[PDB]
Design a protein around this motif. Structure first.
Motif, PDB file in Angstrom:
ATOM      1  N   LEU A  44       0.965  -0.884   0.018  1.00 52.78           N
ATOM      2  CA  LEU A  44      -0.028   0.159  -0.155  1.00 52.78           C
ATOM      3  C   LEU A  44       0.846   1.438  -0.009  1.00 52.78           C
ATOM      4  N   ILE A  47       2.098   2.024  -3.622  1.00 49.60           N
ATOM      5  CA  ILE A  47       0.711   2.566  -4.792  1.00 49.60           C
ATOM      6  C   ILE A  47       0.991   4.247  -3.817  1.00 49.60           C
ATOM      7  N   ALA A  48       0.698   4.585  -2.812  1.00 45.14           N
ATOM      8  CA  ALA A  48       0.726   5.935  -2.026  1.00 45.14           C
ATOM      9  C   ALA A  48       1.867   6.619  -2.817  1.00 45.14           C
ATOM     10  N   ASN A  51       1.976   6.851  -7.538  1.00 44.02           N
ATOM     11  CA  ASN A  51       0.716   6.798  -7.216  1.00 44.02           C
ATOM     12  C   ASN A  51       0.494   7.171  -8.988  1.00 44.02           C
ATOM     13  N   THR A  52       1.019   7.239  -9.285  1.00 38.16           N
ATOM     14  CA  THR A  52       0.395   7.672 -11.183  1.00 38.16           C
ATOM     15  C   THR A  52       1.461   6.717 -11.697  1.00 38.16           C
ATOM     16  N   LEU A  54       0.532   3.503 -13.153  1.00 39.57           N
ATOM     17  CA  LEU A  54      -0.583   2.213 -13.288  1.00 39.57           C
ATOM     18  C   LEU A  54      -0.342   1.048 -13.686  1.00 39.57           C
ATOM     19  N   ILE A  57       0.260  -0.048  -9.847  1.00 40.16           N
ATOM     20  CA  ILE A  57      -0.545   0.526  -8.508  1.00 40.16           C
ATOM     21  C   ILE A  57      -2.037  -0.829  -8.710  1.00 40.16           C
ATOM     22  N   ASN A  58      -2.113  -0.993 -10.393  1.00 38.77           N
ATOM     23  CA  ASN A  58      -2.736  -1.951 -10.517  1.00 38.77           C
ATOM     24  C   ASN A  58      -2.026  -4.029  -9.420  1.00 38.77           C
ATOM     25  N   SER A  61      -1.600  -3.418  -5.799  1.00 40.20           N
ATOM     26  CA  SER A  61      -3.791  -3.628  -5.259  1.00 40.20           C
ATOM     27  C   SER A  61      -3.949  -5.024  -5.520  1.00 40.20           C
ATOM     28  N   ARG A  62      -4.127  -5.929  -6.686  1.00 42.35           N
ATOM     29  CA  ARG A  62      -4.452  -7.178  -6.324  1.00 42.35           C
ATOM     30  C   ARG A  62      -3.324  -7.940  -5.090  1.00 42.35           C
ATOM     31  N   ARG A  65      -4.497  -7.844  -1.559  1.00 42.02           N
ATOM     32  CA  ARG A  65      -5.308  -8.500  -1.059  1.00 42.02           C
ATOM     33  C   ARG A  65      -5.128  -9.922  -1.253  1.00 42.02           C
TER      34      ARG A  65
END
Ligand code: AR
Ligand code: CA
Ligand code: CA
Ligand code: CL
Ligand code: FE
Ligand code: FE
Ligand code: FE
Ligand code: FE
Lengths: 199, 200
Positions: A44, A47-48, A51-52, A54, A57-58, A61-62, A65
């Motif tokens: 996370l 990602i922060a 943040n741009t 792509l 961040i994808n 994120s996966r 999870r």
């Protein structure tokens, strides 16, 4: 082309770490659970910070999870075995490898993915070193986590190749491999999942 | 119940001027919305880390963070399909403003924190509902699906608050946060965010 785990890693899990692991399995489970959480938490933070980006961040994120599912599974197992929610501090390993990261972009992001690759790769190697010496439920569980740790190792390393040159990444892997090996083979005060050889 | 309907729970509707501004700058809204899903996931992991032995909190907060990250991914696919490029959008004043009412001493620091969560989720549910009559089909479909899950997160966050605090002390926190949330949603604002006041 992505090495096999044993080829990528500077050393095997010492026989002494495993002897220590089997004598204190309640601490191991708590620390494993904590490590699944720190993985998600670390994804996370990337990602922060990026943040741009792509493609990053994808994936992150996966991955976050995936790590949280694992974090829950380990909480499930802890309850079945009446392991109590006891505070265990972080080993030196994770903080140890991050101290290697360079302060400037775009190398700082490459270095961070490689460290990620090593943590995943070592967890895979270490689960496999443990499986044979565990009960069936814990053995079946840790055998299950094996294929996904290898995939997270592949994932982190592929993502480094996306954001840096073959040569710079070979050099980063070399420097980290050594630091990682020294952390595993050095003596340590506390049995963690990624700890050294116990004093 | 001690868990009202959303409009009952909230201290005001979404102003029509927020909506006017939002419909003019839907791309900034999407990006802030994407950042909010993500922030909700990080906020949940902070609570896991801060309250590392609260076993009921840790289980629910792990499940919620995964839910918020699916929403984060869904917003990213939507932006891609519609050729909305990523760019830096700073956090709005709203969640900070609310977080500053959180009392500094346990066990009420936690209760207060979860009540704030209930207000963020309730507002989002309300604001999604206010927006969707004004959007195109795909965007309206997406925001309708999100509104169902905000309602749960609001219920969840309030029930969790009751699991850890006195009924009368919750009511006195709800009452205090309600008033400040309203002040934040009704007062003028420099910027458009999902939870901004009325832009200028
Ligand atoms: Ar939107
Ligand atoms: Ca080797
Ligand atoms: Ca006991
Ligand atoms: Cl999931
Ligand atoms: Fe995992
Ligand atoms: Fe993993
Ligand atoms: Fe959400
Ligand atoms: Fe939500």
């Amino acid at each position: 082309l992505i090495p096999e785990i044993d080829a990528f890693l500077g050393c095997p899990t010492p026989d002494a770490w495993i002897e220590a692991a089997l004598a204190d399995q309640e601490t191991l489970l708590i620390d494993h659970k904590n490590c699944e959480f720190k993985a998600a938490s670390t994804a996370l933070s990337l990602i922060a910070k990026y943040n741009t980006h792509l493609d990053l961040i994808n994936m992150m994120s996966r991955l976050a999870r995936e790590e949280l599912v694992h974090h829950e599974q380990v909480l499930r197992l802890m309850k079945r075995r009446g392991v109590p929610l006891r505070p265990v501090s972080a080993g030196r390993y994770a903080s140890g490898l991050r101290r290697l990261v360079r302060a400037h972009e775009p190398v700082k992001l490459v270095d961070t993915l490689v460290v990620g690759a090593f943590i995943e790769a070592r967890s895979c190697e270490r689960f496999a070193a443990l499986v044979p010496h565990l009960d069936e439920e814990l053995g079946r569980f840790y055998h299950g986590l094996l294929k996904s740790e290898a995939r997270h190792y592949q994932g982190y390393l592929k993502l480094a190749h996306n954001y840096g040159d073959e040569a710079d990444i070979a050099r980063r892997v070399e420097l980290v491999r050594a630091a990682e090996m020294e952390l595993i083979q050095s003596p340590d005060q506390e049995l963690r999942f990624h700890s050294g050889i116990p004093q």
